Amino acid sequence: PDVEALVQAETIAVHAGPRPYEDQAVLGAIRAAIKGLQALSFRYEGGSTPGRTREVTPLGVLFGRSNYLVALEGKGGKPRSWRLDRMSDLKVLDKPAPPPQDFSLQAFADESFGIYHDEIQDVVLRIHKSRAEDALRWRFHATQQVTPEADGSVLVTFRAGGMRELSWHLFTWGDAVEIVAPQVLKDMMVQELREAGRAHGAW
Amino acid sequence: QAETIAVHAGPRPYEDQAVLGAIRAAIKGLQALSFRYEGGSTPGRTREVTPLGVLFGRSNYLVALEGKGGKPRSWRLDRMSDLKVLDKPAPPPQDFSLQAFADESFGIYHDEIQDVVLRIHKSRAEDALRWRFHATQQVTPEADGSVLVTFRAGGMRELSWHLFTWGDAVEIVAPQVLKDMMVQELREAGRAHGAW
Fold first, then answer.
1. Fold of domain B114-193
2. Do B167 and A112 touch (CB under 8 A)?
3. Locate the WCX domain: which residues (chain A) (predicted)?
4. Distance between CA B194 and CA B188 in Å, rounded?
5. Which of A43, A95, B97, B187 would you label with B79, given CA atoms 20 to 30 Å apart?
6. How far is A138 from A173, CA to CA, in rounded Å?
């Protein structure tokens, strides 16, 4: 697999700065369930039925600042991401739960910057010349294409879901990023900026 | 494929997979690691270290110590090259913790250490209780259901970026430098994106 995932799974790498409290016992239960080809049950403090017990076929773990279990809930259910920081009362069931042989975990991981895989967006950004070199060493997405423009800017294009999380990241680029598309990313960014600007007394 | 781990999509630095592989092999084998280090005091010099772990973030770092009795410190992955796993013993210090290093003073950040005081609105208080802002943090319920979060840390720039992810649910009580930074970044990004 990706070495970036490997070193985090092995606790050789940590994400600096604020992040969820996460219990290594939860990861151990998931790994044991996957290794044994067994079903996994847990209490999920999220979604419509908070505190309810869910039984899933676990498929893998997505590693990042927050970690996610990818799993199918019930025959006919789709691959879905569950945040590890909302999972408790893990039980490795004494029941076989074979995964599909077509599913690509790393393909699934790249569909979205967030929890939901609903609408993939065609994202187009323009990074101003002052940050252009940084942009050339920056991994926005696995699918990205970077194009130098005539004035020293770089265009960055990629396809992904998860616009809220992406707009949080774009804040870190300051005034050096222009959002070219999609409109929903512009509107999300502007609404978040107005909310936070009012709250902090920026204007 | 039998793939059971993956990296969540998230914008992040380019990272040389070979470099992480060499660091991981050195750490698992309890072996020393050598590399050319760009910049710093002796640019381009070959350094030999006891490797300890990796930090992901705004930039990626090796955590490692140099020389007998050396103190753990950070090295930028993007200034490292010519990695070699050596056949010398390099066990970690008996008291070393990667997560503690991640939170320790001047481990990666260079600004002044601040007393951070935040108030988080009731609508996100449950989330704040399950959130690890810093190892030194204390969270205190207020009578109106909000929570107070206090901690002592550097890295105000990175912290202000993270606070943007809490929206209108976080009030910065202190330090003033964090307030000012937050406001300046909001005004700049707001003007750039057309929000005011």
1. Alpha-Beta Plaits (3.30.70)
2. no
3. 121-196
4. 10
5. B97
6. 11
